[PDB]
Design a protein around this ligand. Structure first.
Ligand SMILES: Cc1cc2nc3c(=O)[nH]c(=O)nc-3n(C[C@H](O)[C@H](O)[C@H](O)COP(=O)(O)OP(=O)(O)OC[C@H]3O[C@@H](n4cnc5c(N)ncnc54)[C@H](O)[C@@H]3O)c2cc1C
Ligand SMILES: Nc1ccn([C@@H]2O[C@H](COP(=O)(O)OP(=O)(O)OC[C@H]3Oc4nc5nc(N)nc(O)c5nc4C(S)=C3S)[C@@H](O)[C@H]2O)c(=O)n1
Ligand code: SF4
Ligand code: MOS
Ligand code: FES
Ligand code: FES
Ligand SMILES: [Cl-]
Ligand SMILES: [Cl-]
Ligand SMILES: [Cl-]
Ligand SMILES: [Cl-]
Ligand SMILES: [Cl-]
Ligand SMILES: [Cl-]
Ligand SMILES: [Cl-]
Ligand SMILES: [Cl-]
Ligand SMILES: [Cl-]
Ligand SMILES: [Cl-]
Ligand SMILES: [Cl-]
Ligand SMILES: [Cl-]
Lengths: 731, 316, 175
């Protein structure tokens, strides 16, 4: 099916099943400890051996030797895998750092060996015996120190200029010039990365924890230098990823290499202490924002530059993009600056670019609104743009930011905020109220599915789409049920296996919309096949209550498969509507915080998110996404930071105690409202992404609330008490 | 983790005798610190002697009118005990401020006293750490030191003692009761129990090889208003940035002890004596010898403000 | 050094979800790894292996603990209850049902731990055990939102399902 015109009326509009807050269909498995994750597939390899990773002890240099005799002789050891004995490897297109290092060390904790043994404990113990010796080389570990020297953009990513920023900034009646930083951050998905490999001759099956089944398959095959057709990837349940499992990691590669060497299945988990340096992290940013407005508060000049660093050839953190689209202004400049840093690989984490970009921009807007004497909600409304500011003939498909903000302000009781900071106490707590906007594009990618109408009337959906805790199982079941007129409980959904059709996977918040659209496409064909089986024209047929009807005539789904099951396999592809229109998603985030007047401790009291993300497919699982993102934004605002040691070149606090994520006790009342934002420009589902949008703007709304509570602006996140203490009131 | 033999015994004396008989033996109680360190091969005992189930887990009134707390009492049970809640509230408060319910359920009185630092360089066996490898250097000194000590430090080590319970024990003049492998008994006041790092930060306590802690003894109740104020970046399940344990009497006299600032609970009698004069006076005495890093200098102001807040709470 | 010692293997009896198990274990093996690798009771999860997350929470003689930080051999003859012992898909525990109704999970990886802790937390409150947020230390704690949040803080959810987890626990506690 080719989606090149906006959607008209179609079966999904009935909303008998889609749009309803159904329980997750994976709930019974997940609450009873019966869903299997990658390290738990015992029947598939009852005598699987255990591989234990050895990571680089240095940030950067050469592995002069890697000796494995003592490890080989250790109790229960089968083999030790190294770069040297693994053979020539390829490199996947989504790996900047090599997944197996040696002789060159590119980052701290880069994998250099794997000991395979009969038991976990024997593997761990033997891994301590692997003898690695090194020659350190000089590295660059400080983004701040590197900034001065990077003053040009990457070759393929030139600055974007509209009108005359410099002139307009000079002319502006009111303006700000401020610098903001965000630290390196870590996914901390609760399931450690893990994989199990089994070879049967030259065929590999890998059970793994991966968001993107098809990319995994291709990248693993390229790395191993084997035909892609000889690889099967399986990941039906993923214990979280947040970007960290978009790509092939060291567990998958090493499991695969090991199992081929020992002629036996091998499973490998990355130990939690190795994850923050071995895998990827959100790059730290250093951002410079210069914004000017006229006497009426209309922005006239906006400049946003961002610096981030990475290993050679790695990605920047795309922190200026939202500034190109979010607010009106005729005179604009945006630019990225990419340093070289020898820290671990920087890469995607939930809302790459927008999360840190809005962490800066949405404080800057609060600063500018304050300087102009304009309420910060009204200030954003005044500066709404319904078109691309760089190409004003290009409309947003639809844009309800104003309505997010107005609805949010009303529900939250925004007018009860004291606009003079620092004047409200609740006992020893200073109370403050803050707001910020969220913004995240809606992206489209090809996606397919196979749908079967079984002889017993039940429906089977197969696609390689993943459910990483998002709800894909459930929303794909809802889609098929809606299209075929069957109860939700009669639909089975099988996911995350490369033996199924290629979906777009879980990433870029395109997963719900694209995966359900491919099921839509498959179901439209299946409806045609059903109609043909009973002798009706599908153009005039309706599907409801387990029947198909056409004007005067009727038949049951049972009758259509008396001949055998009916199977449709189709994909959706997308034309040029995403160029013709700008497709995005919007939010308004409203937060109340308390700041302890003595100690400076920050505690969130209430959070509201109002989101516009197209048609919501399941308001219960969508709400979960947003409260989840609200929580991750609390982390980013108040506690999360990978501490860089810029001498030793690594992240110091590299575990689940040192890198602090929010706990139960941190969590306030969290409310979510979804505006009806049905967007027929997007797809036949009329849905847009939400899973990344939910995070966008959250941290700045907290920062702005801390400012309102205390009168203290903090522009280097996270906002911890040591950044407040010396400007709080007297005790 | 290195393989070890595992031993159950019938009495406490057998446990101490076995620790003497077996080079490299360690006692295991809750396992909640020892096993953490063993997984990383920071502790590498050849032999574990289980000291649970040896009768060392009672809470009893003493003849002098205080409390004898068995070494193997679970932290949950100690915090929950009626007499502790009523008469030694600051100890209950300190225990409940630490760790999580799962960990408090298993952690024990002596194990908690003997938990080791949370320094991240100590925990990463690839990094310089004098505590782990004498003379290798102290990575924290000029590295990431936000969570480290501000007083009682040396050039060799700026680590803190992480225990909340130990701060209340120090405030209460707790006495550590032991049996030696020779079969004698010793009493060590908690104030004398933790060694300064000096040039030997690998040597942490007054215990002799294979000495077994059997109990902690408390004196008679002090009365007054008991407070344990723990400051942390997140609301629960984190170690203290700074903590203040206080017992404040109706006249405003009392005593205080602090966590998060030193290699042990930090209390000075001359500072206790100034409580009625206010937080600035108490602070000046407590931190006259402070030697912070740039990264942890905020703990000094934090301690003063937290003490002020605590005394205001007592007045209210 | 140049060598590491061979496993010391010991016989071990555990009662796991009502069933007598007789095992031979490496002394190093945690209760967590005995459940998962030896007994194939994979519902108990490993999120960190160092006591930092709660994903491995189980009940030992009714008391919750982190199974990654205790040795199997330390629990000879103990009664262990895991998530599988509380219920299954065709016979859900009321707490499992509450988590489904309120959507108290996303990825599902912390959920075994959250559920085992929840059940234990309600019992700890019934037993009069105070917490960090109990204002009147001498009196009996009440089952309030604040109490529940504090007492569950040893179970980390990176998905951030906390608000729904609290709603599930409060629903289960009200019944
Ligand atoms: C992630 C996490 C967060 C935490 N947060 C807190 C916090 O906020 N506050 C805080 O106070 N604690 C915290 N803890 C630490 C915890 O309180 C301690 O690990 C615990 O008190 C240790 O007691 P245990 O009985 O488990 O000791 P074990 O681990 O069994 O033993 C500790 C050491 O004591 C020795 N030993 C044991 N009993 C005896 C005895 N009777 N005699 C002589 N030697 C003995 C052992 O050989 C060993 O060297 C945390 C723990 C983790 C894992
Ligand atoms: N219009 C819409 C869109 C979404 N949804 C709900 O939201 C989920 C997310 O859909 P979508 O926004 O399309 O996100 P993806 O399917 O593309 O999933 C990826 C996304 O998922 C996000 N949320 C996550 N949440 C869980 N628990 N764990 C992860 O790793 C997560 N990773 C983050 C990251 S990073 C990203 S990119 C749906 O499954 C559905 O429950 C809905 O009902 N209607
Ligand atoms: S402070 Fe004490 S513990 Fe932390 S690194 Fe320096 S020596 Fe090793
Ligand atoms: O695009 Mo989400 O996996 S960073
Ligand atoms: S696996 Fe046990 S606390 Fe994380
Ligand atoms: S459900 Fe994914 S971690 Fe709590
Ligand atoms: Cl419903
Ligand atoms: Cl229809
Ligand atoms: Cl609804
Ligand atoms: Cl809902
Ligand atoms: Cl960890
Ligand atoms: Cl740390
Ligand atoms: Cl809603
Ligand atoms: Cl030294
Ligand atoms: Cl004293
Ligand atoms: Cl003061
Ligand atoms: Cl040996
Ligand atoms: Cl229980």
């Amino acid at each position: 099916m080719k989606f090149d015109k906006p959607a008209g009326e179609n079966p999904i509009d009935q909303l008998k099943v889609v749009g309803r807050p159904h329980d997750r269909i994976d709930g019974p498995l997940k609450t009873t400890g019966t869903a299997r994750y990658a390290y738990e597939w015992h029947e598939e390899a009852p005598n699987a051996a255990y591989g234990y990773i050895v990571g680089s002890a240095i940030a950067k240099g050469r592995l002069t030797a890697l000796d494995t005799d003592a490890a080989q002789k250790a109790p229960g050891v089968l083999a030790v895998i190294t770069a040297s004995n693994a053979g020539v490897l390829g490199k996947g297109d989504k790996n900047t750092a090599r997944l197996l290092g040696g002789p060159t060390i590119e980052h701290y904790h880069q994998a250099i060996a794997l000991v395979v043994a009969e038991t976990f404990e024997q593997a761990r113990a033997a891994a301590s015996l692997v003898q690695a010796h090194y020659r350190r080389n000089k590295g660059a570990y400080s983004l701040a120190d590197e900034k001065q020297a990077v003053n040009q953009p990457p070759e393929d990513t030139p600055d974007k200029n509209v009108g005359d920023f410099d002139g307009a900034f000079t002319s502006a009646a009111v303006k700000i010039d401020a610098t903001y930083t965000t630290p390196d951050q870590s996914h901390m998905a609760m399931e450690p990365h893990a994989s199990m490999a089994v070879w049967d001759g030259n065929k590999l099956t890998l059970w793994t924890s991966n968001q993107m089944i098809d990319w995994c398959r291709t990248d693993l095959a390229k790395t191993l230098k084997v035909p892609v057709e000889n690889v099967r990837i399986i990941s039906p349940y993923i214990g979280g990823g947040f970007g960290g499992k978009l790509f092939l990691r060291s567990d998958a590669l090493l499991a695969a290499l090991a199992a081929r060497a020992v002629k036996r299945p091998v499973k490998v988990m990355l130990p939690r202490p190795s994850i923050p340096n071995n895998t990827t992290h959100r790059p730290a940013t250093l951002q410079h924002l210069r914004i000017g407005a006229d006497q009426s508060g209309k922005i006239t000049a906006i400049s946003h530059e961002s610096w981030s660093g990475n290993l050679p050839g790695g990605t920047p953190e795309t922190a200026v993009q939202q500034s190109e689209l979010l607010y009106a202004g005729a005179n604009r400049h945006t630019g990225l600056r990419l340093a070289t840093l020898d820290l671990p690989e920087g890469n995607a984490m939930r809302a790459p670019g927008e999360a840190p970009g809005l962490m800066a921009l949405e404080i800057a807007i609060d600063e500018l609104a304050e300087k102009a004497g304009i309420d910060p909600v009204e200030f954003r409304i005044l500066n709404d743009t319904q078109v691309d500011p760089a190409g004003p003939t290009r409309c947003f498909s639809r844009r309800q930011l104003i309505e997010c903000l107005r609805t949010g302000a009303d529900k939250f009781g925004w007018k009860q905020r004291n606009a003079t900071p620092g004047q409200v106490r609740d006992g020893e707590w200073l109370v403050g109220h803050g707001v910020a906007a969220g913004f995240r594009n809606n992206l489209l990618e090809k996606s397919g599915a196979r749908v079967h109408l079984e002889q017993n009337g039940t429906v089977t959906v197969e696609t390689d789409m993943t459910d990483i805790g998002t709800g894909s199982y459930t929303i794909l079941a809802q889609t098929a049920a809606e299209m075929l007129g069957v109860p939700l409980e009669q639909v089975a959904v099988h996911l995350g296996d490369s033996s199924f059709p290629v979906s777009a996977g879980s990433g870029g918040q395109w997963g719900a919309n694209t995966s359900t659209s491919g099921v839509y496409a498959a179901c439209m064909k299946l409806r045609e096949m059903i109609a043909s089986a009973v002798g009706f024209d599908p153009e005039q047929s309706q599907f409801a209550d387990g029947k198909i009807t056409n004007g005067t005539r009727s038949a049951t789904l049972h009758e259509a498969t008396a001949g055998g099951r009916l199977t449709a396999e189709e994909s959706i592809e997308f034309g040029t509507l995403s160029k013709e229109y700008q497709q995005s998603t919007f939010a308004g985030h409203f937060v109340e915080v308390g700041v302890h007047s003595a100690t400076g401790e920050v505690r969130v009291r209430r959070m509201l998110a109002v989101c516009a993300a197209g048609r919501i497919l399941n308001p219960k699982t969508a709400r979960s996404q947003v409260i989840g993102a609200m929580t991750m934004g609390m982390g980013a605002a108040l506690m999360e930071e990978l501490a860089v040691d810029d001498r030793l070149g690594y992240f110091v606090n590299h575990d689940m105690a040192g890198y602090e994520v929010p706990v139960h006790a941190d969590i306030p009342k969290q409310e979510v409202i979804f505006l009806d934002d049905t967007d027929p420009i997007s797809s036949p589902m009329k849905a847009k992404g939400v899973g990344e949008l939910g995070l966008c703007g959250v941290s700045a709304a907290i920062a702005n609330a801390v400012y309102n509570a205390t009168g203290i602006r903090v522009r280097d996140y996270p906002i911890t008490l040591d950044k407040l203490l010396d400007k709080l009131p007297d005790v | 983790m290195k393989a070890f033999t595992y031993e159950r015994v019938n009495t406490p004396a057998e446990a101490a005798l076995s620790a003497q008989r077996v080079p490299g033996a360690k006692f295991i109680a809750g396992g909640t610190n020892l096993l953490d360190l063993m997984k990383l091969e920071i502790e590498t005992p050849t032999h574990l002697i289980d000291v649970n189930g040896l009768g060392l887990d009672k809470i009893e009134v003493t003849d002098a009118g205080g409390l004898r707390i068995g070494a193997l009492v679970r932290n949950t049970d100690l915090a929950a005990h009626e007499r502790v809640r009523r008469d030694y509230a600051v100890l209950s408060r300190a225990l409940l401020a630490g760790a999580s319910g799962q960990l408090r359920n298993q952690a024990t009185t002596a194990g908690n006293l003997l938990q080791r630092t949370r320094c991240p360089y100590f925990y990463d066996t690839n990094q310089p750490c004098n505590k782990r490898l004498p003379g290798s250097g102290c990575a924290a000194l000029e590295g990431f030191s936000r969570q480290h000590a501000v007083v009682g430090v040396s050039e060799a080590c700026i680590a803190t003692h992480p225990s909340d319970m130990a701060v209340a024990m120090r405030l209460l003049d707790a006495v550590v009761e032991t049996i030696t492998p020779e079969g004698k008994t010793r009493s060590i006041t908690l104030a004398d129990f933790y060694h300064p790092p000096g040039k030997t930060p690998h040597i942490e306590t007054a215990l002799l090889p294979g000495e077994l802690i059997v109990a902690v003894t408390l004196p008679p109740p002090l009365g007054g208003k008991h407070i344990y104020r723990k400051v942390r970046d997140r609301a629960s399940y984190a170690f203290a940035l700074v903590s203040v344990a206080a017992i404040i009497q109706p006249d405003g006299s009392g005593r205080v002890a602090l966590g998060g600032v030193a290699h042990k609970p930090w209390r000075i009698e001359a500072a206790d004596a100034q409580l009625s004069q206010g937080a600035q006076a108490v602070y000046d005495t407590l931190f006259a010898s402070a030697h912070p890093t740039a990264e942890n200098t905020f703990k000094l102001l934090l301690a003063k403000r937290t003490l002020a807040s605590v005394l205001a709470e007592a007045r209210a | 050094p140049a060598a590491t010692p061979a496993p010391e293997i010991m016989p071990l009896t555990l009662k796991v979800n009502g069933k007598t198990e007789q095992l031979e274990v490496d002394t190093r093996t945690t209760l967590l790894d005995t459940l998962r690798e030896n007994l194939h009771l994979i519902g108990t999860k490993k999120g960190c292996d160092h006591g930092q997350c709660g994903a491995c929470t189980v009940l030992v003689n009714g008391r919750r603990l982190n199974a990654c930080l205790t040795l199997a051999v330390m629990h000879q003859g103990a009664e262990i209850t895991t998530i599988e012992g509380l219920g299954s898909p065709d016979n859900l525990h009321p707490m499992q049902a509450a988590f489904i109704k309120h959507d108290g999970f996303q990825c599902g990886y912390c959920t075994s731990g959250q559920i085992c802790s929840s059940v234990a937390v309600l019992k700890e409150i019934q037993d009069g055990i105070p917490s960090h947020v109990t204002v009147d230390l001498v009196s009996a704690p009440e089952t309030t939102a604040d109490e529940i949040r504090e007492r569950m803080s040893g179970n980390i959810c990176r998905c951030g399902a906390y608000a729904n987890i609290l709603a599930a626990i409060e629903d289960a506690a009200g019944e």
